[PDB]
Ligand SMILES: Nc1ncnc2c1ncn2[C@@H]1O[C@@H]2COP(=O)(O)O[C@H]2[C@H]1O
């Protein structure tokens with residue numbers, strides 16, 4: 001991918017250990033990132049410091065793009081390393097020059113923005129239309145749809161903690177545990193340690 | 201704006217009467233739109249066909265952009281004229297050519313995508329974190345912030361139906377009615393037929 005190589009040749013790459021915060025909500029935005037290796041969580045917080053996970057981003061994803069198109073923006077969310085990460089960084093002004101040179105790099109970034117808006121909109125609908133059981137169920141389905149989900153003779157299998165499910169749906173880890181027990185009883189799912197099979 | 205004029209010279213413009221649906225969820229996406237005049241609502245539905253309003257778009261806004269960056273996409277939402285509209289239309293293929301010619305047109309589109317993702321993310325946090333009252337109240341404030349809100353000696357005045365407020369916050373028209381009554385009692389707002397005076 002010559003496009004990617006050319007873009008990256010203009011970035012400076014930095015390593016972030018698991019759990020480190022790459023981006024703090026409210027900081028002034030002047031730089032774009034790209035995940036060469038690793039995975040991160042994008043999250044927001046309520047007034048009680050409870051975190052919610054808006055998105056998981058991985059190798060190939062841009063981050064910190066939302067301040068690119070208007071100056072004086074603040075970072076709209078926190079971004080925290082789930083794994084150890086290699087992350088390329090580049091100033092907004094330099095990136096703008098790259099765009100004038102070859103707009104395919106902006107098309108790639110924008111393609112990701114479009115996907116993120118589609119998925120985030122779906123999350124709005126889930127939060128507004130479903131009760132807690134429905135939200136948890138739909139989250140299990142969505143995770144069953146991820147590339148890293150592994151086939152199972154009963155359905156599709158995923159790994160994730162009660163805590164993480166809770167951070168995605170907006171509930172406590174306890175509530176999540178009770179609801180997963182129910183879905184197991186209704187023979188819709190199966191549970192293990194940190195492994196779940198979704199029947200479908 | 202010469203960049204906008206240039207762009208428009210490549211579009212074909214069409215008129216849509218109030219209430220007409222410009223875009224149906226699920227259609228195959230191959231064309232981009234731009235609102236020369238008028239305003240529209242972007243909405244989604246539950247399985248029972250209740251509608252929720254994700255966004256209001258106006259003169260200057262692109263629409264139907266989400267299918268641009270990958271082929272074989274379906275329209276992610278319904279878009280319906282709130283007023284009568286003049287809307288420019290152009291094939292994705294042709295728009296891609298325009299981008300190669302002058303990427304500023306893609307920068308404009310992408311600036312809107314970025315704003316939409318920021319605001320939609322905030323909506324996720326509101327649904328997750330606030331109760332129907334914090335939500336209804338905040339919605340009243342937001343509408344009080346709109347350019348079409350008219351000054352009042354008590355505060356700022358807006359017009360909108362219980363039904364519409366409910367479609368924005370994700371609750372029934374009845375629930376909305378009861379909550380507005382409460383906010384009237386707490387002397388935070390005043391009500392009329394389809395008119396509300398947000399105090400302060
Ligand atoms: N809803 C979302 N979906 C995916 N990524 C997001 C979302 N909201 C914020 N982000 C990412 O969080 C980043 C942190 O700061 P920025 O606002 O500069 O750019 C942001 C986006 O890259």
Ligand SMILES: Nc1ncnc2c1ncn2[C@@H]1O[C@@H]2COP(=O)(O)O[C@H]2[C@H]1O
Nearest residue numbers: 121255263264265266267275276277316
């Ligand atoms: N969350 C949103 N905020 C603003 N506009 C949206 C949102 N979700 C969908 N739209 C618009 O609805 C359009 C309908 O089809 P597209 O998916 O082609 O492109 C879409 C966007 O223009």
